[PDB]
Amino acid sequence: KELNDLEKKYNAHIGVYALDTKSGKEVKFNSDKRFAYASTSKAINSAILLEQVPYNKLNKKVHINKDDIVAYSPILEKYVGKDITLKALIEASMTYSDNTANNKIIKEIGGIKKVKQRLKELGDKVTNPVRYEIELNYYSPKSKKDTSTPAAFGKTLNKLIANGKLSKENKKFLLDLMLNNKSGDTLIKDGVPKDYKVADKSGQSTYASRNDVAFVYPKGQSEPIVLVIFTNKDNKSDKPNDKLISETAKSVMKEF
Amino acid sequence: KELNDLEKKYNAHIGVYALDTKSGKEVKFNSDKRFAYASTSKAINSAILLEQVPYNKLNKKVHINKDDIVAYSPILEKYVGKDITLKALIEASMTYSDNTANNKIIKEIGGIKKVKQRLKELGDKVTNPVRYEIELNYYSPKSKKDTSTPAAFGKTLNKLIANGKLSKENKKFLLDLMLNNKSGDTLIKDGVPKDYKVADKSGQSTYASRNDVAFVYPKGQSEPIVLVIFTNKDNKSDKPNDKLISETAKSVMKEF
Numbered sequence: 001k002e003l004n005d006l007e008k009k010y011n012a013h014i015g016v017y018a019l020d021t022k023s024g025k026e027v028k029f030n031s032d033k034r035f036a037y038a039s040t041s042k043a044i045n046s047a048i049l050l051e052q053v054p055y056n057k058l059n060k061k062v063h064i065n066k067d068d069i070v071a072y073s074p075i076l077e078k079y080v081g082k083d084i085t086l087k088a089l090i091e092a093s094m095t096y097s098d099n100t101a102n103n104k105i106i107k108e109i110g111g112i113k114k115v116k117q118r119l120k121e122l123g124d125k126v127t128n129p130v131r132y133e134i135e136l137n138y139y140s141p142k143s144k145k146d147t148s149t150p151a152a153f154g155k156t157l158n159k160l161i162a163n164g165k166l167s168k169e170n171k172k173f174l175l176d177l178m179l180n181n182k183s184g185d186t187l188i189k190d191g192v193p194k195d196y197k198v199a200d201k202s203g204q205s206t207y208a209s210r211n212d213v214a215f216v217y218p219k220g221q222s223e224p225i226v227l228v229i230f231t232n233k234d235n236k237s238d239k240p241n242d243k244l245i246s247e248t249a250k251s252v253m254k255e256f
Numbered sequence: 257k258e259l260n261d262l263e264k265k266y267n268a269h270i271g272v273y274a275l276d277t278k279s280g281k282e283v284k285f286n287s288d289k290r291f292a293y294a295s296t297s298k299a300i301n302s303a304i305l306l307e308q309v310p311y312n313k314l315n316k317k318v319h320i321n322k323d324d325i326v327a328y329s330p331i332l333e334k335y336v337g338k339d340i341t342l343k344a345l346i347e348a349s350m351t352y353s354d355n356t357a358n359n360k361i362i363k364e365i366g367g368i369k370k371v372k373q374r375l376k377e378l379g380d381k382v383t384n385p386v387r388y389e390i391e392l393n394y395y396s397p398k399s400k401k402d403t404s405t406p407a408a409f410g411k412t413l414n415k416l417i418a419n420g421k422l423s424k425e426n427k428k429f430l431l432d433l434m435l436n437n438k439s440g441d442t443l444i445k446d447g448v449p450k451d452y453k454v455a456d457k458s459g460q461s462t463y464a465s466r467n468d469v470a471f472v473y474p475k476g477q478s479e480p481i482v483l484v485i486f487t488n489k490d491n492k493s494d495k496p497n498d499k500l501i502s503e504t505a506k507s508v509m510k511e512f
Binding site: 066069070071072073074077078080096097131132134135138145182183185186190202203204206210236237238239242 | 322325327328330333334336352353387388390391394438439441442446458459460462466492493495498499
């Protein structure tokens with residue numbers, strides 16, 4: 001197969017970065033191109049919070065309020081003017097891409113400002129968190145706001161989680177969420193051999209920016225394969241096509 | 257307060273149209289001004305499909321395939337390759353802003369084409385459906401694609417649900433999906449007294465386009481008040497302020 005042909009075929013753009021955690025083999029097509037990462041950012045945001053907040057403390061509470069409410073928050077919507085623990089807050093973010101849960105998680109971290117420098121400290125001078133959800137989705141191929149290359153964002157998912165500074169309990173919490181998230185069944189999950197497991201977090205933005213990042217797990221393999229697939233179209237209101245992600249997933253997984 | 261002073265207080269554009277379906281009294285403000293409708297239109301599409309499917313046949317199933325899946329489908333994301341009843345579809349979209357659902361419903365009608373002939377048949381040549389869910393969220397103060405105006409949208413809801421050809425069951429079914437959803441809690445629901453039952457549907461687009469349409473029930477009245485508030489800011493990335501919606505619903509309501 002060929003990723004290049006996939007672009008002619010689908011008239012989209014492909015940003016790929018696969019890093020085997022075992023071999024250390026890196027497959028990449030356009031991994032140094034900037035694309036809108038979209039809601040996939042919530043892996044980074046909640047991995048960071050897990051760095052500071054111990055698992056024995058995820059029972060803690062935060063009071064959700066009116067100003068904390070944003071469009072598209074399936075669960076947190078039922079908590080307006082109420083409390084909720086961090087665990088439940090982080091599950092909403094990952095299981096449902098709840099926006100109220102992500103923004104609250106960001107504020108607890110100290111704001112976009114903090115998330116940003118942590119990236120820097122992590123040694124990531126590419127990812128550019130500038131806005132909160134839902135605004136981070138208004139992508140413009142002219143701007144850099146809320147963008148990242150596949151190799152940059154790809155390494156960050158690695159350095160934060162795989163070879164992370166997280167605990168073993170937090171790490172396994174996150175991964176469970178990402179494993180049971182039914183939102184990516186028509187993307188990567190739909191393209192990796194039946195046997196492989198995927199801990200994912202997808203997204204979509206303007207310009208038909210459909211993405212999916214996941215920690216894939218081959219047969220008999222213990223170390224996943226970090227797989228960041230970022231894609232996009234030439235036009236603002238173009239409809240994306242998950243098939244392209246599913247197909248890009250299998251062209252690349254052939255190498256692993 | 258005054259609608260002209262809240263635009264100052266929040267630096268936004270308020271568009272209002274409240275219709276007292278009993279006396280016929282109207283309260284307007286920038287009623288002829290095009291505002292993006294966003295998901296408020298999910299109330300139109302479901303209403304339309306409920307004019308051609310008697311309640312006793314909402315249990316008719318339709319298959320959901322990978323192909324049907326789109327971003328933000330909290331419910332329908334779990335039906336990849338599963339059948340689902342018409343009733344379930346409506347609930348999904350009406351209660352969760354599920355887009356895979358809103359699009360299934362649009363498909364069941366005969367497409368935006370049918371939806372469109374109907375709006376013309378209702379005497380609505382203002383509402384401008386062009387794109388689908390999600391893309392219809394990408395508002396452009398320049399474009400007129402997927403826009404309506406306070407009065408046009410208000411009246412269309414009136415001719416459709418409020419005293420329109422849906423059946424008793426079908427009208428209670430839809431109004432219940434609107435009364436019981438927890439997403440307009442901070443919007444119109446906030447402003448009017450708890451004596452006022454509120455059945456609504458919200459939406460949010462670019463340029464902080466936070467809208468909210470409802471059929472508000474004054475304490476001691478079975479006749480509803482069609483309240484249509486559409487608002488927005490000048491910049492593509494601004495943050496919305498539901499307070500603006502609440503306050504507006506509070507003042508506009510003083511006049512009824």
